[PDB]
Design a protein around this ligand. Structure first.
Ligand SMILES: Nc1ncnc2c1ncn2[C@@H]1O[C@H](COP(=O)(O)OP(=O)(O)O)[C@@H](O)[C@H]1O
Ligand SMILES: Nc1ncnc2c1ncn2[C@@H]1O[C@H](COP(=O)(O)OP(=O)(O)O)[C@@H](O)[C@H]1O
Ligand SMILES: [Mg+2]
Ligand SMILES: [Mg+2]
Lengths: 237, 237
């Protein structure tokens, strides 16, 4: 029962519309794919639906698990309603295994194990290439307080506990993932954006087949065929 | 470690080979589909793998739940090892909802509910069209004793309890299914044969989409695409 109103913002993957309710937003997932800081792009038919549906499922699982988030309800195969927040410009990354950009940064082979989950912070500024930030840099930038950063790390690790187990029970290894959080008018914080194969590195527990955006980044095959596997492992739409 | 030996029997869906172990059989699932008492047939690439993998998963779930069965271990994407039994010539059917042949028999629309699961016995004799049998007919034929029939009913309902729930947790409605049981040398009975979309009627809980052999019977689309959904809902191979 909102209704989609004027467009407020259009990013690389989704369109953000305002609704008749001031603190409710209408999110539309596009059938667009991007990689390598936007250097690689393409239209992927059906991608928006897959990510909207998967994101819906994962946020609902988080809600059931007691993890605060902005997801309100799914609206269509490609759209969903969420709580409006003012995003803290940080990409909060959790890595359970060494892979992707981290593997490249330290020169280690993907799959290298970690003693415990690693939390990394990246500046959400595409013009700057979303550079890695030391926590001290966050305070220099005044992006968040020391207590907020500590809370974000705790929140991200809580998300990891829930999702890592959820995926493992479904024969999927949650290698790493990226989260975004936002502030409410009263200063409260809620997990926001998206949680999908675009934002999570997922390997099949048996074959180690890649079922995430790496499929597009490295041209490993059909991106939607891979994402469909995840959707069904999660129980379907 | 048994090794595949001579072919003992080839049915309409699988090939049964003997192994170096007298009480162990080697089952190979074929890429063939049949319907309407063998009146409709076709080769379906990949079907054998899907049924072998799904059957493996379901028998393993049954084993975990404490339900005795002949499944030993999966051998390849299309083959599996099982305990040899002498099959009781009965197709034990459990129906949770009215559909398929039952809907046709009583002239009711598919989907009509039942107060409790219904157990039906069919004579496993394709030359006779696998006719429905009253329990009294079973005794006339001397196929099984009254105590065995009672035990088979209990066993089938126990399988329904476990599988109905397992599928429901994965957004799949187990509409009905057919089982086969066999006797060991000492008179013990084990659930045998197969448990797959070929032998189970499965509807998606949300869309009621048919994800079983009805897809082939009624030409509703790709049979393997439908079966793949079930495989992934169950956690993948
Ligand atoms: N609940 C929310 N309230 C306000 N902004 C949000 C919320 N969740 C996500 N966003 C923002 O909406 C955008 C999502 O689109 P994309 O993810 O397509 O944008 P980018 O392309 O990330 O800017 C991001 O800028 C993200 O920070
Ligand atoms: N564990 C088992 N031991 C011996 N026979 C079995 C066992 N499980 C199934 N069978 C039989 O093997 C055959 C399976 O192939 P299909 O299912 O292709 O045969 P039909 O085509 O049903 O005879 C059936 O006749 C079935 O009754
Ligand atoms: Mg984004
Ligand atoms: Mg058979």
């Amino acid at each position: 029962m909102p209704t989609k109103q004027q467009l407020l913002y259009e990013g690389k993957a989704k369109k953000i519309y305002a609704t008749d309710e001031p603190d409710v937003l209408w999110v539309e997932y596009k059938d667009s794919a991007t990689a390598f800081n936007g250097e690689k792009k393409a239209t992927i038919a059906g991608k928006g639906r897959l990510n909207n549906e998967i994101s819906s499922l994962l946020f609902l699982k988080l809600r059931e698990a007691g993890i605060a988030n902005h997801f309100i309800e799914k609206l269509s195969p490609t759209e969903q309603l969420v709580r409006r927040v003012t995003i803290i410009p940080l990409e909060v990354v959790v890595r359970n295994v060494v892979a992707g950009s981290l593997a490249k940064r330290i020169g280690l082979e993907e799959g290298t194990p970690l003693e415990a989950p690693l939390v990394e912070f990246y500046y959400k500024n595409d013009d700057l290439g979303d550079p890695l930030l030391l926590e001290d840099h966050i305070f220099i930038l005044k992006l968040a307080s020391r207590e907020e950063v500590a809370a974000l790390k705790q929140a991200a690790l809580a998300v990891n506990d829930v999702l890592r187990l959820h995926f493992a029970e479904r024969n999927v290894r949650l290698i790493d993932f990226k989260l975004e959080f936002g502030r409410t008018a009263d200063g409260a914080i809620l997990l926001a954006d998206e949680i999908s194969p675009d934002t999570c590195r997922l390997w099949d527990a048996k074959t180690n087949e890649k079922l995430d955006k790496d499929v597009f980044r490295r041209d490993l095959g059909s991106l939607t065929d891979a994402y469909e596997v995840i959707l069904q492992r999660l129980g379907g739409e």
